[PDB]
Design a protein around this ligand. Structure first.
Ligand SMILES: NC(=O)N1CCN(c2ccc(F)cc2)CC1
Ligand SMILES: NC(=O)N1CCN(c2ccc(F)cc2)CC1
Ligand SMILES: NC(=O)N1CCN(c2ccc(F)cc2)CC1
Lengths: 412, 412
């Protein structure tokens, strides 16, 4: 037997806005967050654009002195997490602090910091490496710093499952609460890889869209002219809470987390299998986990990265899992607007899945001008679609063939 | 309802050996694996030694053509993983591959790789960054590559909780099996942070021993002349298996994992509290999880990093948890011999804890010539101590105030 887990606070930094309601406003308007990257020489790079967080002010959250110690990915993680805790109204007390934990992850961690400390190392030698290099760059420091700032003494950890991080972080946090290891968890992910090493590293594998002329049209999941993913920055955090705990203090409940699925493709380091066999098993696992029949699913927030092999794999997976229901559900890539926030993708897409439930609206797949061969599902081309949504899925399918699926349900 | 979990396979690279047996022989003979570092010129560094893996042949495991693309931490993770699975005698099949997963972690991941690609980027341009940069450097690719080579389709993930990584990886993997998400898990961690940025970054914070002129005597946990930890490399992997699944196949069972604790200090980014309050919460959680009287605990493999504040915190935590029984159990730090394998520390030390149960011997704390103020427990100074061990506990503490405790006992 198992406790029920609800969403009582959400927080976000995205290429679309500095919080949830502003990000969600852009999502439903089909606005693009993608733009050429500024204050950075990308002359020798084949990709010169992505989704930046615009106008982030870390001094709303931290002193200038504490923020100087921390990589951007950690700043962004703390911002979404502080937002999510404030959004929840939860009061931390000596009576509950041991029951409140954190699992905020990252796919790639502190590349920006690693790059600036490399610059100092090569130019001037090791004696110019920042004393805060290690604690200021390691992925578990969003969980670390958040626990220290708020006095959280519950489970304290960090996932790193590349592009699956945010989905796994939220799912495993839900498990902690369901099986009684915590009553509250702050979970999600953050990322800032759209630095030299992120653009160069992914650009070297030719994984990135090179559509420098039309950056807002670059991210075009299931469109026959897609040429790979758009690199994006930001964070999502959710406050996950045991139902009775949330009801007792009179929390505002956005939605219930009913289902979590995991699988491994065991196929290829970067490419999914053509038929999405792994993504199929993971969605089936998530629906079994939630005790739901595939027929009950109304809305899927796809992984939808705009990679040719990735997008077609997800069409196959859904047709295989949903059979004659596959056309009835709506499925959209919000990455058409946000780009791919990698380890944070699952976190911001879980929030969009929750908000699709609250507002009864499927977010668009923008730029889906010419669906590809086989891409005949309801991919919500171009514009948001108001519709009935009781059950929403959020999928992540990342490098190493690691799969995550979250099942959200309306709560009333 | 909650199932029991046993250890059926173990694997290791350490500064003492290229497998578990050779490493364990070094542990029981009090041998140091710490030496001046040869793979690079450290004359501008304030620390020039640590625990290298000596004579590692990746060609025992992988083609030189796959090896070339992978960071040593991934190479070390796979080697220990391959050892653990072979040691288990487990055969992967279509009937069970969905029921076998992997959780192999790292604190820092592919810092060597990311540094060298940073050098290429700075000296030559983005066009000289390896196409394998991302899949060859990111922390989740031990779990990824292991699943690809063995065909593991179970839960596929990675923890990154700094120096607590291996302990958390093992504990959460046991929970997966406990709660029916998997019947088999390959779990542990790997680390190779001995690059310029690693030795430099830990050196900038003055966290490392600077005993360059006597490296084998540098790691001296609870000794009054200790002066920081010794950075070491390697990997530990265990096969965790549901008890009845292990019984059904006549598996050889080394020990039972009965207990898993996590807590957060919520104290400091890098310093443990003097009183050991977070470590004490974590051990109490693990002992209650195991349904034990604290007097049943015979052996503690301490975190024991040879830092001033870390070592004394641990005495205080153990005195607070076990009271008068603190004076009857044996506690030692195998870090005295191996140094600090960071995210891999929890993995090798869990294997040392299991082997203490198999052979009925407490490994020594070497170099404990002058125990510090209040360091007055049985710390097994200098020499291995044959003794009765029914219950063994392995502790890790890390940056972000993240704590882990594992509880093992003999299985008949
Ligand atoms: N070249 C190869 O045979 N592999 C597979 C493709 N590849 C890759 C793809 C996308 C990405 F973002 C990172 C790496 C590089 C390694
Ligand atoms: N401000 C200072 O003098 N430093 C930097 C922060 N902190 C630290 C400790 C251990 C470590 F491995 C990395 C960083 C304490 C020492
Ligand atoms: N006086 C002591 O220090 N003891 C008493 C408790 N004891 C124990 C043994 C088996 C068991 F099932 C429960 C408890 C072990 C050590």
């Amino acid at each position: 037997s198992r406790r029920r887990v609800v969403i009582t606070g959400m927080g976000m930094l995205s290429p679309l806005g500095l919080d949830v309601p502003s990000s969600w406003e852009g999502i439903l308007a089909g606005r693009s967050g993608i733009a050429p990257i500024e204050h950075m020489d990308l002359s020798a790079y084949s990709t010169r654009f992505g989704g930046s967080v615009k106008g982030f002010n870390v001094e709303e959250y931290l002193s200038a002195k504490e923020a100087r110690k921390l990589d951007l990915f950690i700043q962004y993680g703390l911002a979404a997490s502080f937002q999510a805790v404030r959004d929840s109204g939860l009061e931390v007390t000596d009576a509950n602090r041991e029951r409140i934990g954190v699992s905020m992850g990252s796919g790639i961690g502190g590349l920006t910091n690693i790059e600036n400390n490399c610059r100092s190392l090569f130019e001037q030698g090791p004696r110019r490496i920042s004393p805060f290099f290690v604690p200021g760059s390691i992925i578990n420091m969003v969980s670390g710093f958040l626990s220290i700032h708020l006095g959280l003494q519950g489970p304290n950890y960090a996932l790193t499952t590349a592009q699956t991080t945010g989905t796994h972080s939220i799912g495993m946090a839900a498990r902690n609460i369901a099986y009684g290891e915590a009553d509250v968890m702050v979970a999600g992910g953050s990322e800032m890889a759209a630095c030299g090493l992120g653009l160069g590293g992914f650009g070297a594998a030719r994984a990135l869209s090179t559509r420098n002329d039309e950056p807002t049209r670059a991210s075009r999941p299931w469109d026959r002219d897609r040429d790979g993913f758009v690199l994006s920055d930001g964070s999502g955090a959710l406050v996950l809470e045991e139902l009775e705990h949330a009801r007792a203090r009179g929390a505002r409940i956005y939605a219930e987390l009913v289902g979590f699925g995991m699988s491994g493709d065991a196929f290829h380091m970067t490419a999914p299998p053509e038929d999405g066999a792994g993504a199929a098993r993971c969605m089936k696992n998530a629906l079994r986990d939630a005790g739901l029949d595939p027929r009950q699913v109304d809305y899927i927030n796809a992984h939808g990265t705009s990679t040719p092999a990735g997008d077609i794999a997800e069409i196959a997976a859904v047709k295989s899992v949903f059979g004659e229901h596959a056309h009835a559900l709506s499925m959209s890539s919000t990455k058409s607007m946000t780009g791919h926030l990698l380890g944070a993708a699952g976190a911001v897409e879980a929030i969009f899945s929750v908000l699709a439930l609250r507002d009864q609206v499927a977010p668009p797949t923008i730029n889906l001008d010419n669906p590809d061969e086989g891409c005949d599902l309801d991919l919500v081309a171009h514009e948001a679609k108001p519709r009935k949504i009781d059950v929403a899925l959020s999928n992540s399918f990342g490098f190493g063939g690691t799969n995550g699926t979250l099942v959200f349900r309306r709560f009333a």
